[PDB]
Amino acid sequence: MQVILLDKVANLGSLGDQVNVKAGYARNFLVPQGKAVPATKKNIEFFEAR
RNA sequence: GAACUCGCUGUGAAGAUGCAGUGUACCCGCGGCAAGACGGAAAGACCCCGUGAACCUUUACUAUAGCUUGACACUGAACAU
């Protein structure tokens, strides 16, 4: 879905991008291993402040 | 069911101890033979009926477990076409 990147990711990422990703590549790789977070419109200001 | 519980011919729900005709027979036990009724091995074998029941078979009908097919979900990324 709408996850935002956080790292030195390959060629879809620029340290934070709103992309259209699938659910299976979202969880177990990008959810809790690091590097992403689901964009529930509360975290879009919270981690950009970080 | 009750009996004071004879044999013939005939009649009769059509094979009569009981009806009609006729014949015979003192009253009552006992031991036997099984011909009739009455039971037994019960014909719990033969047949029909019920818009009865039960199992069983199948290319009866309608379903279903199982097996099997595809879609979607669990389920992703890099390339090449």
Side-chain angles (χ1 to χ4, degrees), chain A residues 15-34:
Chain A
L15 274 299
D17 283 324
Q18 295 180 356
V19 297
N20 189 5
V21 78
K22 294 182 181 180
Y25 184 66
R27 62 184 178 272
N28 299 318
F29 188 77
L30 293 176
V31 197
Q33 190 182 3

Side-chain angles (χ1 to χ4, degrees), chain A residues 6-48:
Chain A
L6 293 175
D7 285 332
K8 299 295 290 184
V9 196
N11 299 116
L12 77 163
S14 64
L15 274 299
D17 283 324
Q18 295 180 356
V19 297
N20 189 5
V21 78
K22 294 182 181 180
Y25 184 66
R27 62 184 178 272
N28 299 318
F29 188 77
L30 293 176
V31 197
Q33 190 182 3
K35 193 182 265 77
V37 59
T40 61
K41 291 183 180 180
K42 182 68 176 177
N43 294 320
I44 58 99
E45 293 179 355
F46 186 76
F47 282 165
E48 290 292 328

